[PDB]
């Protein structure tokens, strides 16, 4: 049989797909996640804050 990729296929998005949220997903916290401090963030982190005494 043909072992190569098929170039004659639909290259566009499928509108006939389920548009709703999936109830069959893992509802639990992920234990396999980066536990470290992520040395990539805005180090000048004064971007925008309330300048008044109260929120």
């Amino acid at each position, epitope marked *: 049989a043909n072992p190569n990729a098929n170039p004659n296929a639909n290259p566009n998005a499928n509108p006939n797909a389920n548009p709703n949220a999936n109830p069959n997903a893992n509802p639990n916290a992920n234990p396999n996640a980066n536990p470290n401090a992520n040395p990539n963030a805005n180090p000048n982190a004064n*971007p*925008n804050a*309330n*300048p*008044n*005494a*109260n929120p």
Partner: antibody
Amino acid sequence: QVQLVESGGGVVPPGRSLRLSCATSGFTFSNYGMHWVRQAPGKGLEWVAIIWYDGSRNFYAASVEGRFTISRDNSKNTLYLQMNSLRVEDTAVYYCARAAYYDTSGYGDYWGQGTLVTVSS
Amino acid sequence: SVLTQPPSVSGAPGQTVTISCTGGSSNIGAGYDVHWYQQLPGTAPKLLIYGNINRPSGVPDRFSGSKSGTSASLAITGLQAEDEADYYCQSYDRRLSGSWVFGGGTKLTVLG
């Protein structure tokens, strides 16, 4: 009622300083932060600087950082804006406006009259 | 001038005109609010709309606004002779170190 009156404008040769102020009345000056906005003749508005209510945090625009200084004396209800080494490009109408925060952005509920500072040679 | 506003728009008295402010994914598309100011020719700018839907007591009910994605608009109905003024859109930009960013500004003309 909130009243913001500005004074201290005029014509200044380039290379020297000129000090502005904005007097406040009718609201607790010490409990609000407040901004500076300048408008060049025939141009739009451009944000200048903001100071926190306690004065702890100061923010300046990229064009005037290191030259402009903003300071407040809450016992006189007057905010002070020092502009050192004035250039010809600093000719604009400066506005003093109170700071407000709605959800995630800032805006000015009350604005002052505004004063003109012209630099020419 | 990170925000873009048309140089000038015009319309007949009493009609509806649209003033639009197109931003980017960093200022308007980032989820930050847009505030509109109406500056009279002879006085300081006055607050018009805050929170993208809320207006002060002085602002009449004709003025309204909304935002979607990276763009925001100011909708004015029933144009009057006193509506001739400059309108500015204001938001916050993540990529700069300024609390506010101002657009080019739109001059509104009423064909009186």
